[PDB]
């Protein structure tokens, strides 16, 4: 019964991060989604206030309980390399490095492949990406599809166009 | 300018939510939360908690204030029936019929046509409804489309097809 650890930022775009927890609750995939925050309690790129399971601080040293990580992007994202020294941000980059390294399934929208990418993890596999965030693969081959399913790494332009690869990442968990 | 009531159930469905709160933010289109619950605190189907504006107990009276209802759907819809002394469960059938009676614009997925054609208001009126909910259609004229534009109502079969009317929607709310 396969698990995935969802990582959703602060703020998180609601859209793009309940894609995916409906779509695994729907289908019978068991997920935990950890904040990338101090607090489980996060807000959502709208304002909403979102309380998830748990942390990431929490995540760490138990990746191997997972089989795949989703990085659920939003609005903290533009903002990561201002504060890439913030604890969960740190934690951020030592578990997809982790899971990445692990073999675990790497799944993500937006700036998701940017994410990877910044871990060394993506290296040589096709990614789709934000048209912004582009120029910023450095490892990781970007294209310009909706989305890009390649090895272990299963990644969405936007969360407009996460339909494009969700049968295909609910397939590979069932 | 417009301003958009959304209606959200306990545990309501996160992934049609937040395609409507999105849609709204990227467009500043305003809306204000009222949970169809005793407490501004409700669940998703998936689980999460969101923490939402107000309950629907102070939407009463104060309809007039909004331009537009949505009704946001989720796996409370199908025990609503069983559930008469739930207040909160008789003041959306008010609110329902009120915001309806004063000719504002109804939007819903997935059972919303439903929940609508219980007070009435859907009379001779086509609507996308969710294939198990159909057959409770009498008063609106429920067809098998993807998503239905007819008058004042916007309603889409289930969450998978909101992207099919919801440009119509921001559209109108503009
Ligand atoms: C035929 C086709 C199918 C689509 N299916 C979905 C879908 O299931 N869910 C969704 O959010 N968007 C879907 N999109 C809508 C896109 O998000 C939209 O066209 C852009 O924003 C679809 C678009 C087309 C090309
Ligand atoms: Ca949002
Ligand atoms: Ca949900
Ligand atoms: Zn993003
Ligand atoms: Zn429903």
Known sequence: AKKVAVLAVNPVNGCGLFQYLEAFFENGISYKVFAVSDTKEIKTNSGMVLIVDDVIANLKGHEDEFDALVFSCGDAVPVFQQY???????????????????????????????????????????????????????????????????GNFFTAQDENTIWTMLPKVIEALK
Request: one cysteine or more.
């Open 84 to 150: 890439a020294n913030q604890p969960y941000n740190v934690d951020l980059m030592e578990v997809i490095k982790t899971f990445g390294e692990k073999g675990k399934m790497m799944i993500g929208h937006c700036a998701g492949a940017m994410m990877f990418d910044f871990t060394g993890i993506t290296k040589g596999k096709k990614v789709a990406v934000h048209p912004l965030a582009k120029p910023a693969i450095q490892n990781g081959i970007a294209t310009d599809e909706k989305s890009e399913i390649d």
